[PDB]
Amino acid sequence: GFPTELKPGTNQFLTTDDGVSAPILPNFHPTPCIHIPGEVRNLLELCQVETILEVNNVPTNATSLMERLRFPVSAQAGKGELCAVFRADPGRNGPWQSTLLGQLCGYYTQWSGSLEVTFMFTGSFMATGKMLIAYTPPGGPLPKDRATAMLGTHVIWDFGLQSSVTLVIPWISNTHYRAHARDGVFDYYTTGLVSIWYQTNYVVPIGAPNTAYIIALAAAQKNFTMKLCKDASDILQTG
Amino acid sequence: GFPTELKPGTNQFLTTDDGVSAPILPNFHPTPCIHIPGEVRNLLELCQVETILEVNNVPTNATSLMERLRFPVSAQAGKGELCAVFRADPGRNGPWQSTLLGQLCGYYTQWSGSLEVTFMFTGSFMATGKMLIAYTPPGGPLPKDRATAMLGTHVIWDFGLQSSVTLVIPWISNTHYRAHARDGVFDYYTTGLVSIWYQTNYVVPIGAPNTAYIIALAAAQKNFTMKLCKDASDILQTG
Amino acid sequence: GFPTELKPGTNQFLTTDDGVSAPILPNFHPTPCIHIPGEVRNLLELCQVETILEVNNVPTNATSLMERLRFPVSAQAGKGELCAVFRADPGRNGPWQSTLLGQLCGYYTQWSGSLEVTFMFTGSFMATGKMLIAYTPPGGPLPKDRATAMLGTHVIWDFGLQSSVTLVIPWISNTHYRAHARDGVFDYYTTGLVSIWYQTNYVVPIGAPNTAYIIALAAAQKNFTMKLCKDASDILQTG
Amino acid sequence: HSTAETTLDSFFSRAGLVGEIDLPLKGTTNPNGYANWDIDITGYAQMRRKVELFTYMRFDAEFTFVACTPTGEVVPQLLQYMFVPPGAPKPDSRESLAWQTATNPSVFVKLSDPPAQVSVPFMSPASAYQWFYDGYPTKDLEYGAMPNNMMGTFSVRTVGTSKSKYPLVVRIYMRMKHVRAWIPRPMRNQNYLFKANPNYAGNSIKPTGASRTAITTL
Ligand code: NA
Ligand code: NA
Ligand code: NA
């Protein structure tokens, strides 16, 4: 016959070997595929789609869960007050957990790219005022006050003029490896921070509510990517 | 030698693997094939050949079996009476079981296409009258009366004018999967119905019989097909 | 290495597999073949060579064995008498067993083609007379008399005019399968018959013997063939 | 849109179980450590009716031998599968010289080695096998017998002069290949009674299919 030598690895079954195997029904002709709208070909498409960011991940009371989808701004607040704050950490526990992006990061080990967060003011039309949205790069600590926050990267948002505004997180990278307890994780450290401050007070005329809500939508930019598949979940098929 | 690695599946015997094996008599030269008339190359050819449809699958008495091959029309019947009725279900138990088409469906799991049923009036030449043959698509229920049957797809057949007439079942599809008892079958639901009604009474002159028979022939159309081979039969080779 | 899957048949030893095996003496150079006269390349060559047909397979007495090689014709015989008779059955027991053709048929299972039998009269030169050699195709029964034999295929042989004459058995075919006792053989049924009759009496002058012998030689024609090798013999190497 | 599954080759593909040879240690059954299985495609129940949809057929066959003990256990035993072609004498004893006749192809294999597999050609001296023969081979008991359909015989046995230490079973699977058929005919609708003929139980003549109460009630 033809001379051969079996090499190590012979007979092994590697769960990730993508070889070819004998067809059970060789004559079977699968019904043909037709066109179905909305095919997805790469998860990154979904990652780029904005979903609601539960910045207000505070109430746990079952009947208040819907409140996590929006945070408020009110007349009561005084100019300069810190409104809300959160970090740009898609893969870690927190607000991003509500985003489809955060959820998908959970199926991977490493990732990086730019992010985008859009804030939608849903108060009355008659309501006006200014908010200062600021990004503090990684390492930098939450600004003591509005004043110092203003010295950094920021946007003065006049919800009297425009109802939405989008902030861009230039770069996040979950690559630095850690080996804490005895469980080795691949965590950020690249936690940039987004702080929202009242620049002016909430201004409203007679007859307009004194509290309005902001909805935050977020997604990854086109330069975003993920590596090392990692199946993990608390939600698994039941017995 | 030449480096090789045996992969899973090595040494298995798959009853449906269509590989090649060593020839027992390498020098033997089989007598040559000559031309035999009537070669069949695809069962679908046989499926398209009309065979008798036992619409009248009622008598079981051994000496009356031949009666199942034909149903009657008579003087006695009054205009409007329902003559006979059957469903377009080649693969299921019933009249189609007599047809070669029905029998072949039994060697498969799924199928679809158009059907054709030809009705042959074999009464006297002197006999005349009209019958209304109607097709009620799947879902639709057997028509209450001739009147309503007429509102649907139908053919007014004058056996005074033409002795045969062919109805076309536009489409049947045995694809919907079922899991009843504990035995999972792939059944129709696409049971369209063919109902035959007396439009006029049977008219005959003195000396002509008052009962005549109709023979039903059926077959699948050219757009017919079958999938998933399934060997099944009650008639098996004996011990 | 290179991915492989061993298939059924792996490791088996099939006595008729004509594969290739490792050479024991790779450097050995066999003495070269020279030209030897008389090479045979296909047994069919030998089958076409005439050998003596023991039509007279009667005497068994050791010292009379040579008599089987020839049958006689004599003065004593009267016009019309049946001289000898035999069937055209190369592969079966009987006269053909003496022929090399018959012997070779024994190494095969099936065969067919035309045959040829040449009769050589070896009587005195002064002797004269006529014999009627007749072939009765398969199915046909030995002719009652010369008269009826003459109605069929035949040759009037005048051994006064020509000393040899050749008859052609148009066709024999040992293909019909049989399963008698419990041993399944592939027998003829295509036994055509060759009958030899005295047309005239043996005529001789004073001084010439009153008995002469005929030698029969036979062989297969060029359209002859054999199938299915079958080693069989009573003559085997001894202990 | 495709129609490959309804081709004759598709309809007759697959390797089915056609034979089962039992080689017990103690027993009434096959007491001589050998067995002769004449090739019968009818071994797979379902086959008879299918091939009989046609009058004439032509094909090759791939035979696969799956051997083990009655518990499916694998043991260190050498076996011999000898194919004695039609016209050849089958062995009559564990010591028959037939087992040694070269013209009977034999495959020697270990029960540990994967299944043995070989191909058997169209053997008939006729142009095609034929399931029906309205005639007699040159009232009678020979009616309908087409002998020229013999495919051959497989003689199975453990190797050796002494009986095997183990109880064995050899299952024979056959895959038809290169199929051709002619003259289709009505499909058997009455149960079979005898392997060799179409005889049907005249008392129990059943209707081709199911029945109902009246022709007007579904
Ligand atoms: Na390797
Ligand atoms: Na193979
Ligand atoms: Na070799």
Query: Chain B residue closest to A24 (CA)?
Result: B16
State whether residue C185 sits within 8 Å of chain D by CB.
yes
Burial class, A157, CB count within 10 angstroms (exposed 0-12 / middle 13-18 / buried 19+): buried
Chains that touch C (3 or more CB pairs under 8 A): A, B, D
* Residue type, position B147, single letter: A
**Mutate: best of B6, B13, B42, partner A, most A CBs <10 A:** B6
For β-strands C51-52 and A225-229, DSSP reports them as unpaired
Chain breaks in chain C (C to N over 2.5 A) after: none
* Residue type, position C59, single letter: P
* Residue type, position A26, single letter: P
- 3-state helix, strand, coil split of chain A in percent (to 5) is 10, 35, 55
**Cβ–Cβ gap D192/B236 under 8 Å:** yes
- The 3 state secondary structure assigned to D13-74 is CCEEEEEEEEECCCCCCCCCCEEEEECCHHHCCCHHHHHCCEEEEEEEEEEEEEEECCCCCC
Helix (H, G, I), strand (E, B), or coil: what is residue D177?
A: strand
Cβ-based neighbour number of residue B97 at 10 Å:
23
A210: its two tokens:
């004194």
Residue D127 Cα to ligand 2 middle (Å): 28
**Contacting residues for C209 by C-beta, under 8 A, at least 6 apart:** C123, C124, C127
* Residue type, position D185, single letter: R
Distances C141 to A233, C85, C86, C93, C134 between C-alpha atoms, Å: 93, 12, 12, 19, 12
Cβ-based neighbour number of residue B186 at 10 Å:
17
Kindly list the protein residues that place their beta carbon closer than 5 angstroms to ligand 3, a single-atom ion. C 19, 21
Alpha-carbon distance of B204 to C139, in angstroms, equals 62
**Cβ–Cβ gap A21/B8 under 8 Å:** yes
Q: Which of D147, D150, D146 is nearest to D132 (CA)?
A: D146
The number of distinct structural domains making up chain B is 1
Residue B63 Cα to ligand 3 middle (Å): 67
Residues of A within 8 A of D5 (CB-CB) are 27-29
Cβ-based neighbour number of residue B54 at 10 Å:
28
Cβ–Cβ < 8 Å for B127, B212: yes
Max distance between CA atoms of chain C, in angstroms, equals: 97
Q: Which of A222, A188, A43, A220 is nearest to A110 (CA)?
A: A188
For β-strands D54-68 and D34-38, DSSP reports them as unpaired
Cβ–Cβ < 8 Å for C127, C203: yes
Question: C120 forms bridges with which residues in the sheet?
Answer: C164, C215
Minimum-distance CB partner of B36 among D8, D182, D212: D182
Alpha-carbon distance of C160 to C137, in angstroms, equals 28
C56: its two tokens:
């007279």
* Residue type, position A207, single letter: G
Alpha-carbon distance of B80 to A59, in angstroms, equals 73
D9: its two tokens:
């080759």
**What counts of helices (H) and strands (E) characterise chain A?**
3, 11
Alpha-helical segments (H) within D167-216: none
| Sequence spans of domains, chain D | 1-218
Distances B7 to A10, A11, D66, D110, D111 between C-alpha atoms, Å: 7, 5, 21, 22, 21
- Spacing of C-alpha B133 from chain mean position: 17
Alpha-helical segments (H) within chain B: 44-47, 100-105, 146-151
- Chain position carrying tokens 């449906």: B16
Minimum-distance CB partner of B13 among D66, D194, D215: D66
C77: its two tokens:
């015989």
Chain length of chain B: 239
**Contacting residues for A195 by C-beta, under 8 A, at least 6 apart:** A82, A84, A85, A133, A134, A136, A142, A143, A149
- Determine phi and psi for B16, rounding to 5 degrees: -105, 10
Residue C1 Cα to ligand 1 middle (Å): 5
Chains that touch D (3 or more CB pairs under 8 A): A, B, C
Residues of C within 8 A of B4 (CB-CB) are 1-4
Burial class, B228, CB count within 10 angstroms (exposed 0-12 / middle 13-18 / buried 19+): middle
- Chain position carrying tokens 């997604």: A219
Q: Determine whether domain D1-218 maps to CATH 2.60.120.20.
A: yes
- Chain position carrying tokens 């003011």: A121
* Residue type, position B22, single letter: A
Cβ-based neighbour number of residue C147 at 10 Å:
11
Minimum-distance CB partner of D46 among B20, B58, B236: B236
Minimum-distance CB partner of B9 among C1, C5, C16: C5
Experimentally determined by: X-ray
Cβ–Cβ < 8 Å for A188, A172: yes
DSSP string computed for D123-161:
--SSSSEES---S-----S-TT---TT---EEEEEESSS
Helix (H, G, I), strand (E, B), or coil: what is residue D181?
A: strand
* Residue type, position C88, single letter: A
- Determine phi and psi for A234, rounding to 5 degrees: -100, -20
- Spacing of C-alpha C30 from chain mean position: 39
Cβ–Cβ < 8 Å for B230, B149: no
For β-strands D54-68 and D129-130, DSSP reports them as antiparallel
Alpha-carbon distance of B144 to B151, in angstroms, equals 11
Question: D74 forms bridges with which residues in the sheet?
Answer: none
Q: Which strand (E) or helix (H) includes residue A202?
A: none
Residues of C within 8 A of A14 (CB-CB) are none
How many Å lie between the alpha carbon of A9 and the closest alpha carbon of chain B? 6
**Cβ–Cβ gap D209/B22 under 8 Å:** no
Burial class, B61, CB count within 10 angstroms (exposed 0-12 / middle 13-18 / buried 19+): exposed
Buried b (16+ CB within 10 A) or exposed e, D127-147: bbbbbeeeeeeeeeeeebbbb
**Contacting residues for C212 by C-beta, under 8 A, at least 6 apart:** C72, C73, C74, C121, C122, C123, C124, C127, C202
Distances A185 to A86, A93, B96 between C-alpha atoms, Å: 22, 13, 66
- Determine phi and psi for B92, rounding to 5 degrees: -90, 165
DSSP class of C150: H
Alpha-carbon distance of D29 to C232, in angstroms, equals 30
- Side-chain-facing half-sphere of B239: CA atoms under 13 Å: 0
How many Å lie between the alpha carbon of B4 and the closest alpha carbon of chain A? 5
Residue D39 Cα to ligand 2 middle (Å): 20
State whether residue D177 sits within 8 Å of chain A by CB.
no
Domain of residue B92: give its range. 1-239
Burial class, B118, CB count within 10 angstroms (exposed 0-12 / middle 13-18 / buried 19+): middle
- Determine phi and psi for A65, rounding to 5 degrees: -50, -35
**Cβ–Cβ gap D6/B42 under 8 Å:** yes
Alpha-carbon distance of B194 to A146, in angstroms, equals 82
**Contacting residues for B174 by C-beta, under 8 A, at least 6 apart:** B89, B90, B91, B105, B110, B111, B112, B186, B187, B188, B190
Could you tell me the CATH number of the domain that includes residue C64? 2.60.120.20
**Cβ–Cβ gap D107/C12 under 8 Å:** yes
**Cβ–Cβ gap C20/A1 under 8 Å:** yes
- Chain position carrying tokens 């080795």: A184
Cβ–Cβ < 8 Å for C134, C152: yes
Kindly list the protein residues that place their beta carbon closer than 5 angstroms to ligand 2, a single-atom ion. B 19, 21; C 7, 9; D 117
- Side-chain-facing half-sphere of C122: CA atoms under 13 Å: 12
**What counts of helices (H) and strands (E) characterise chain D?**
2, 9
Alpha-carbon distance of B219 to B104, in angstroms, equals 11
Nearest 10 degrees: CA dihedral of C199, C202, C203, C209? 160
A157: its two tokens:
């948002």
Cβ–Cβ < 8 Å for A20, B218: no
Backbone φ/ψ region at D21: left (φ over 0), alpha (ψ -120 to 50), beta? beta
Residues of D within 8 A of C14 (CB-CB) are 105-107, 118
- 3-state helix, strand, coil split of chain B in percent (to 5) is 10, 35, 55
State whether residue D199 sits within 8 Å of chain A by CB.
no
* Residue type, position C201, single letter: N
Q: Which of C49, C74, C54 is nearest to C66 (CA)?
A: C54
Alpha-carbon distance of C215 to B232, in angstroms, equals 67
Alpha-helical segments (H) within chain A: 44-47, 100-105, 146-151
Cβ–Cβ < 8 Å for B86, B100: no
Alpha-carbon distance of A119 to A155, in angstroms, equals 12
Residue B14 Cα to ligand 2 middle (Å): 11
Q: Which of B44, B107, B101, B113 is nearest to B218 (CA)?
A: B101
B237: its two tokens:
């080779």
Cβ–Cβ < 8 Å for D44, D16: yes
**Cβ–Cβ gap C8/B11 under 8 Å:** yes
Residues of A within 8 A of C14 (CB-CB) are none
**Cβ–Cβ gap A27/D1 under 8 Å:** no
Minimum-distance CB partner of B58 among D49, D115, D213: D213
Resolution (A): 2.9
Residues of D within 8 A of C12 (CB-CB) are 107-109, 113, 116-117
Cβ–Cβ < 8 Å for B233, B97: no
State whether residue D103 sits within 8 Å of chain C by CB.
yes
**Mutate: best of A27, A28, A31, partner D, most D CBs <10 A:** A27
Cβ–Cβ < 8 Å for A89, A96: yes
Helix (H, G, I), strand (E, B), or coil: what is residue A114?
A: strand
Helix (H, G, I), strand (E, B), or coil: what is residue A193?
A: strand
B113: its two tokens:
């296409």
Alpha-carbon distance of A71 to D173, in angstroms, equals 73
Buried b (16+ CB within 10 A) or exposed e, A76-115: ebeeeebbbebbbbbbbebbbbbbbbbbbbeebbbbbbeb
**Mutate: best of C2, C5, C12, C173, partner B, most B CBs <10 A:** C5
A12: its two tokens:
């092994």
State whether residue D117 sits within 8 Å of chain B by CB.
yes
Query: Chain C residue closest to D151 (CA)?
Result: C177
First to last CA, chain C: 52
Question: D19 forms bridges with which residues in the sheet?
Answer: D172
